[PDB]
Amino acid sequence: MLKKKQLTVLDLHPGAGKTRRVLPEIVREAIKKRLRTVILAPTRVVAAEMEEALRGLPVRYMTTAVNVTHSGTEIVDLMCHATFTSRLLQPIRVPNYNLNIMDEAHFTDPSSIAARGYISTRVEMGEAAAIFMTATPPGTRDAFPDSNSPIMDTEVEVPERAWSSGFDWVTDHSGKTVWFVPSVRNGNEIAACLTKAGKRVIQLSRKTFETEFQKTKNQEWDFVITTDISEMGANFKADRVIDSRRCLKPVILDGERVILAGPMPVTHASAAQRRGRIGRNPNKPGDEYMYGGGCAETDEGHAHWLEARMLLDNIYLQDGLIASLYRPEADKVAAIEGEFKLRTEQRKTFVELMKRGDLPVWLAYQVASAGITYTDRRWCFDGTTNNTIMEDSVPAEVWTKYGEKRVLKPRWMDARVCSDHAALKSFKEFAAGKR
Ligand SMILES: CC(C)c1cc2ncccc2[nH]1
């Protein structure tokens, strides 16, 4: 696996031991061969679990999710997928790793796709080796892979709104359920319905993940309501998964705005990972998987792959060369390598709008490419009235950095900046010049 010019896909089924058994063996061999190695975790939660599995081995943890005293003797680095892509974009030198290991390599967030693209290009060039660890590599068509113990799979109508009758099976259960919803707003409604029925519910999403996931270990719960983020190696002591089989799809329309289309079907890879949360204990057969729709290849034309090309076009590889997307996911976007390459000052603005501004990649690119500087927020207010952002069915308003009350009406509208209350609160703070 460790030879230069080789990319291996470690596709053992979910729960087969890729992280706790195989990963430490790979790391020991890499250290024996003096290979400068990077290990990429999808989340801070997975980074902390990796430290437990690799404890005793000389690994430099480039994350505050682990409190360790590094010796300075480490040639193996561990960081999140997003951190790797961020450091590549910034004017910080990233070592040319001889071995690149990505855990939960199916992650479809733009920084994860860009990291696979950069790594696979280095391997293709003959410069490095790579190992992508996932039960569901890109283009997998099997939503029902093997498990540690038999699973009871049942196709059934799953509620996506509060209900008063017709779904007794949901609440009659006495175990612990993990329920995948298509959005934070949809989970809020289902959680409120379950709480009204006497259930103890924890909600998980990208922005709350680390904090709320700790509650699944610290307190008793009946349901965990989560978005697709729990497909990335989140483990639960549960006996049932309820899966809506739905997700939202960001779509760029006329190259001018981004909408959150759907809810629409998940991919086979996502369905297999949602199901993969249960059937993990060989001593507990009969965990249930209830699924409420079919699968489809909804990653085709999904904005994350176009956003990954915007990131890769702005990462130095060698002279004017630009990294390609990883071959099995390269057709998900119709884009020319290099079309989003920015000049030095516009590139720095694009990076700061993502890193400090916390803007979606597509929106950060529109602002930087228009020649606007990071702190200039006039674009948040000079769009057409069809770009007015609404709060509780009335236009959202903020006090500008000049002390003037204005309606939020961005020049470019990206639905992700107002997808839920927390996102809109963050965007209002940005529009006001507060970061
Ligand atoms: C634990 C945190 C503070 C951290 C460690 C580290 N090492 C190298 C480069 C960046 C780094 N960040």
What is the DSSP code string of 139-155? T---SS---SS-EEEEE
**Secondary element (H or E) of residue 278:** none
Per the annotation, where are the binding residues? Answer: 12-19
Residues 346 and 292: their CA atoms lie apart, in Å, by: 45
In 228-307, the DSSP E strands lie at: 240-243, 246-253, 257-265, 287-291
Ligand 1 pocket test, pick from 39, 51, 62 with the greatest ligand atom count within 8 Å of Cβ, gives 62
Residue at 27: amino acid letter: V
Nearest CA to ligand 1 atom 11: 62
Block residue for tokens 């236009």: 395
Of 205, 232, 246, which Cα lies nearest the Cα of 419? 205
Ligand 1 surroundings by CB, under 6 angstroms: 60-62, 64
Residues 204 and 180: their CA atoms lie apart, in Å, by: 10
Resolution in A: 1.6
| Ligand 1 centroid to residue 62 C-alpha, Å | 4
| 130 in Cβ contact with 2 (< 8 Å) | no
Q: Which two tokens stand for residue 213?
A: 């996931």
Spell 273-289 as b/e; 16+ CB within 10 A means b.
bbbbbbbbeeeeeebbb
Per the annotation, where are the binding residues for ATP? Answer: 12-19
Residues 375 and 402: their CA atoms lie apart, in Å, by: 13
Residues 225 and 295: their CA atoms lie apart, in Å, by: 20
Q: Is the dihedral of CA 160, 163, 167, 168 positive or negative?
A: positive
| Ligand 1 centroid to residue 61 C-alpha, Å | 7
Q: Which two tokens stand for residue 411?
A: 């020049």
| Ligand 1 centroid to residue 63 C-alpha, Å | 6
Atom of ligand 1 nearest to the CA of 60: 7
β partners of residue 264: 247
| 315 in Cβ contact with 88 (< 8 Å) | yes
| Ligand 1 centroid to residue 43 C-alpha, Å | 16
| Ligand 1 centroid to residue 75 C-alpha, Å | 14
Residues 99 and 4: their CA atoms lie apart, in Å, by: 8
Atom of ligand 1 nearest to the CA of 66: 1
| 54 in Cβ contact with 23 (< 8 Å) | yes
In three-state secondary structure terms, 240 is: strand
Residues 365 and 342: their CA atoms lie apart, in Å, by: 9
Nearest CA to ligand 1 atom 7: 62
Torsion angle of C-alpha atoms 426, 430, 434, 435, degrees rounded to 10? 90
**Solved with:** X-ray
Phi, psi for 371 (deg, rounded to 5): 80, 20
β partners of residue 276: none
In three-state secondary structure terms, 347 is: helix
Nearest CA to ligand 1 atom 9: 62
Of 156, 158, 141, which Cα lies nearest the Cα of 297? 141
Residues 260 and 252: their CA atoms lie apart, in Å, by: 9
Q: Is residue 124 packed enough to be buried (19+ CB in 10 Å), middle (13-18) or exposed (0-12)?
A: middle
Nearest CA to ligand 1 atom 12: 62
Of 133, 125, 139, which Cα lies nearest the Cα of 40? 133
In this structure, the strands spanning 151-155 and 287-291 are parallel
Helix and strand tally (H, E) in the chain? Answer: 12, 19
